UniProtKB/Swiss-Prot annotation:
Organism superkingdom: Eukaryota
Keywords noted in UniProt: Cytoplasm, NAD, Plant defense, Receptor
InterPro entries cross-referenced by the UniProt entry: TIR_dom (IPR000157), Toll_tir_struct_dom_sf (IPR035897)
Protein's name according to its UniProt entry: Toll/interleukin-1 receptor-like protein
Gene Ontology MF terms in the entry: NAD+ nucleosidase activity, cyclic ADP-ribose generating
Tissue-by-tissue expression: Mostly present in shoots.
Annotated gene: TIR
Subcellular location, principal: cytoplasm
UniProt cross-references to SMART domains, sorted A to Z: TIR (SM00255)
Organism taxonomic ancestry: Eukaryota, Viridiplantae, Streptophyta, Embryophyta, Tracheophyta
Cellular component GO terms held in the UniProt record: cytoplasm; mitochondrion; nucleus; plasmodesma
Gene3D superfamilies linked to this entry: Toll/interleukin-1 receptor homology (TIR) domain
Length: 151
């Protein structure tokens, strides 16, 4: 309603780089987008940029769970962006996510950790995009896709 796009990302990894470019392009195409600084319920789309350290943050994972729980009941459409991490690593929490989850496991409720894993697993099964040989092309596709998709 109030926002066409809600941007979920690990600031430390992408705020000043990929996200600054994606946000600029979205605003340019007149796409109303939200991104916190250093409304998920009121956003139509959720572009989630899962970077190397996204899963290292329990806060980012909490946001992903919030988003996926809303997506499950059709309250939001999620667009996955695998940035620097393979989709299968996200799906099984392997690759760099393994060590990040070992950390979480030693300091969080086991059931909460499983809840995080569930969101990631479900997230990795949605149709999305992976970072490749050109971020500028990836940004154009995302903007174009949303642009041809908004009411
Ligand atoms: As992909």
């Amino acid at each position: 309603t109030k926002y066409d796009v809600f941007l979920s990302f690990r600031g430390h990894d992408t705020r000043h780089n990929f996200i600054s470019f994606l946000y600029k392009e979205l605003v340019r195409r007149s796409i109303r987008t939200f991104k916190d600084d250093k409304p998920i319920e009121v956003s139509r789309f959720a572009v989630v940029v899962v970077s190397e350290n996204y899963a290292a943050s329990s806060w980012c994972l909490d946001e992903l769970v919030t988003i996926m729980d809303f997506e499950k009941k059709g309250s939001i459409t999620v667009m996955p962006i695998f940035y620097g991490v393979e989709p299968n690593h996200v799906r099984w929490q392997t690759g760099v996510l393994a060590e990040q989850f070992k950390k979480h496991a030693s300091r969080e409720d086991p059931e909460k950790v499983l809840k995080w894993r569930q969101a990631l697993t479900n997230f990795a099964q949605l149709s999305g995009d992976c970072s490749g040989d050109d971020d500028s092309k990836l940004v154009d596709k995302i903007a174009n896709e949303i642009s041809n998709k908004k009411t």
